[PDB]
Amino acid sequence: MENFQKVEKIGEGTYGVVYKARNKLTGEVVALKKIRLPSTAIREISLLKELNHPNIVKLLDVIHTENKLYLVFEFLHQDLKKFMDASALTGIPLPLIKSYLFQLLQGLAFCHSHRVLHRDLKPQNLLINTEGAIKLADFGLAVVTLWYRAPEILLGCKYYSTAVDIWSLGCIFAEMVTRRALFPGDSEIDQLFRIFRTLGTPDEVVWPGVTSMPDYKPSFPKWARQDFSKVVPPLDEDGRSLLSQMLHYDPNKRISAKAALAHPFFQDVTKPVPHLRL
Numbered sequence: 141m142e143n144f145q146k147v148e149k150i151g152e153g154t155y156g157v158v159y160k161a162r163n164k165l166t167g168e169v170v171a172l173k174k175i176r177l178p179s180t181a182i183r184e185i186s187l188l189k190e191l192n193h194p195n196i197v198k199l200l201d202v203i204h205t206e207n208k209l210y211l212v213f214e215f216l217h218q219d220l221k222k223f224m225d226a227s228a229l230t231g232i233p234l235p236l237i238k239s240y241l242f243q244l245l246q247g248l249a250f251c252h253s254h255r256v257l258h259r260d261l262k263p264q265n266l267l268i269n270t271e272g273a274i275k276l277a278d279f280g281l282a283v284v285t286l287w288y289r290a291p292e293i294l295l296g297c298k299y300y301s302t303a304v305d306i307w308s309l310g311c312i313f314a315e316m317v318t319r320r321a322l323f324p325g326d327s328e329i330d331q332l333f334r335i336f337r338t339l340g341t342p343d344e345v346v347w348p349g350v351t352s353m354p355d356y357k358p359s360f361p362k363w364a365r366q367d368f369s370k371v372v373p374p375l376d377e378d379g380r381s382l383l384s385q386m387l388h389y390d391p392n393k394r395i396s397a398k399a400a401l402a403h404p405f406f407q408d409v410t411k412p413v414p415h416l417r418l
């Protein structure tokens with residue numbers, strides 16, 4: 141736009157490009173997402189403006205002009221992917237990992253109680269600041285990374301539930317802990333099969349109805365579930381217990397964000413400050 145001064149491109153989603161920009165009039169620094177072009181999502185979007193929570197990136201303005209849709213967000217200084225990469229040699233301290241997971245669960249508990257789903261959580265849209273907060277960014281409306289996709293989506297479910305976000309966050313939690321992506325698939329079927337090889341091929345016993353799903357094939361290989369202690373070695377039993385509940389195959393058995401916040405893993409949660417290199 142003319143009201144903004146593009147400082148630099150900082151990302152790109154499936155819907156548009158995000159820039160760090162300065163309001164030529166207020167001097168305010170913001171994140172500006174440009175979507176190159178409906179009359180339905182507009183409400184859905186305009187509604188996201190109401191959402192106000194410490195762990196949700198604030199949507200400041202929505203501007204529809206010249207076949208373009210611009211979303212103005214408060215600017216955060218770094219995303220979790222960059223932070224994880226910067227922390228690869230030493231690893232993120234467990235207390236900070238726990239604080240981040242706890243805050244993200246609060247954010248999800250909030251959006252889910254307002255019937256809002258994210259649908260595409262990943263390290264690149266989890267933003268952090270110098271004060272130790274972490275926030276959910278770039279909510280998805282009703283090379284693409286499939287690493288955090290819930291199995292029901294991969295199997296063709298038509299209606300997503302809040303459980304898809306818990307799964308994605310569980311995958312991110314594991315990655316912060318091990319410094320290795322949990323399920324790094326490079327195709328939908330490779331993604332699905334990597335999940336199967338680790339958690340075991342699901343069946344009607346652990347996931348009632350799974351064999352009736354759109355993309356389920358009786359021909360799927362039958363892998364046995366791997367020992368969970370081999371999945372996230374550096375994580376204590378409270379952490380492993382919580383992770384296993386976030387990664388249940390059955391959407392209805394998968395733990396809710398609200399219930400997760402009450403898990404024993406968070407008994408000693410604190411809010412450490414990260415060492416950020418900006």
Ligand SMILES: Nc1nc(Nc2ccc(S(N)(=O)=O)cc2)sc1C(=O)c1ccc2ccccc2c1
Pocket residue numbers: 150151152153158171173197213214215216217218219222223264265267277278
């Ligand atoms: N609010 C906000 N702040 C940001 N700053 C930032 C500062 C430094 C870095 S970085 N690679 O650490 O130097 C990264 C982001 S982005 C962002 C978003 O609201 C946003 C919008 C669309 C997206 C579309 C796709 C993915 C993320 C997205 C995030």
